[PDB]
Amino acid sequence: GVPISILIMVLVDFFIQDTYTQKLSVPDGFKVSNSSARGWVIHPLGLRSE
Amino acid sequence: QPLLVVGFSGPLLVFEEAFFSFCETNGLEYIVGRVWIGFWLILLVVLVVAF
Amino acid sequence: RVQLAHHFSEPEITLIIFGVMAGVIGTILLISYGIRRL
Numbered sequence: 001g002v003p004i005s006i007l008i009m010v011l012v013d014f015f016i017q018d019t020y021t022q023k024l025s026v027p028d029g030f031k032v033s034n035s036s037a038r039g040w041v042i043h044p045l046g047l048r049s050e
Numbered sequence: 051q052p053l054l055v056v057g058f059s060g061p062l063l064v065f066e067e068a069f070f071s072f073c074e075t076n077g078l079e080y081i082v083g084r085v086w087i088g089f090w091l092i093l094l095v096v097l098v099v100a101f
Numbered sequence: 102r103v104q105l106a107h108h109f110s111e112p113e114i115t116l117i118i119f120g121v122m123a124g125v126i127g128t129i130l131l132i133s134y135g136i137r138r139l
C-alpha cells in the first residue's frame with residue numbers, strides 16, 4: 001500500500017513540471033562531510049591540537 | 051531481534067548539540083571527545099552485559 | 102589537511118586503549134568473582 005501511495009504521488013509531482021517541490025538530496029559521493037576538518041580515521045589524541 | 055531498525059534520533063541530536071556547545075566553549079575537539087565517549091561506552095556496555 | 106604529529110599512530114594507539122580497557126574489564130571480573138564466595 002505504501003509503495004503504491006508513493007508511486008502514484010511521485011508521478012503526480014513529476015508530471016507537474018512548472019511548480020517546484022523539495023526533493024530528496026543526497027551527497028555526491030562516499031566522502032567525509034568536511035574534508036578540511038577530519039579524515040576517515042580519527043586520532044584519539046586530536047586532529048590539530050593535543 | 052532483527053525487526054528493530056537502528057538509526058539516529060532526536061535525543062541523540064540534542065546530545066550532539068550539547069557536545070558541540072561544550073567543545074566550542076572550552077576550545078576542545080568535538081570529534082575526539084566523541085572518540086572517548088565511545089571508548090568509555092564500550093566499557094559501560096561490557097560491564098552491564100557481563101553482570 | 103595537516104595533522105598534528107603523534108608518537109603513536111592510530112592503530113597502535115587504539116590497540117593500547119583496547120588493551121588497557123580489557124585489562125580493567127578483566128580486573129573487575131576477577132574482583133567480582135572474588136566477592137560472593139568468601
Ligand SMILES: CC(C)CCC[C@@H](C)[C@H]1CC[C@H]2[C@@H]3CC=C4C[C@@H](O)CC[C@]4(C)[C@H]3CC[C@]12C
Pocket residue numbers: 086089090091093108109114117118121122
Ligand atoms: C574506558 C576507556 C576510555 C579507558 C579509560 C582511559 C584511561 C584509563 C587510559 C586508557 C588508555 C590511556 C591512554 C593510552 C595512550 C596515551 C598516549 C600517551 O602519549 C599519553 C597517555 C595516553 C593518552 C593514555 C592516557 C590514559 C588512558 C586514556
